[model samples]
Target: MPHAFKPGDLVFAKMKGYPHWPARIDDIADGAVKPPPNKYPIFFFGTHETAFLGPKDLFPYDKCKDKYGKPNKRKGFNEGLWEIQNNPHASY
Candidate 1:
């Protein structure tokens, strides 16, 4: 199971047509409107936008940070965003 998240936690959230992207939890809910698990409200770091997401869809940023190597801070976060959104491995 995915780890629980707090309001201030940072995570990678999956947007329907997009690959997982960076976000920060702004709020949380459980058993809201008959859903089984918690609903996390998040602010997308790149879009500077907000949305609610399912628990399984949220991966803690630290987990992914290591998965890809702590981002090359020498570059702009936007640069990282471009690299990921344009990931060339999506040949499927």
Candidate 2:
């Protein structure tokens, strides 16, 4: 779902753990510190963190996998916000 959403919209990320996390895409930086190709800055509203991500790594709320037969099963996870309790498959 590249370009499925632009900056300033709530989006999904498929990192390893916690079902899935919804991050708010921020505006692109200019002059310096440009984001890599197709990448954008996203803020994790759940805890205290931020990350750079791409459209493929994100799935919008209400756009769960296969709702319309889309190819984003990597998009599996929660559809809303909640505190993370750490998943066994997450990290060390």
Runs in model 1 deviating more than 4 A are 1-3, 27-37, 68-92
What ranges in model 2 sit over 4 Å off? Answer: 1-3, 29-32, 65-92
TM-score: which candidate is best? 1
Q: TM-score for each prediction?
A: 0.58, 0.55
Whole-structure CA lDDT of model 2: 0.53
Clashing pairs in 1: none
Task: Output the number of the lDDT-best candidate.
Answer: 1
Q: Rate the local accuracy (lDDT) of all candidates.
A: 0.59, 0.53
lDDT of 2 by residue, 1-92 (tens): 34466766665566666445655666655764667887877665445356777777777745652342222233332322432223211211
Mind giving the per-residue lDDT tens digits that candidate 1 earns over 11-49?
Answer: 777778666666666643465433235666666664566
- Residue 37 lDDT in model 2? 80
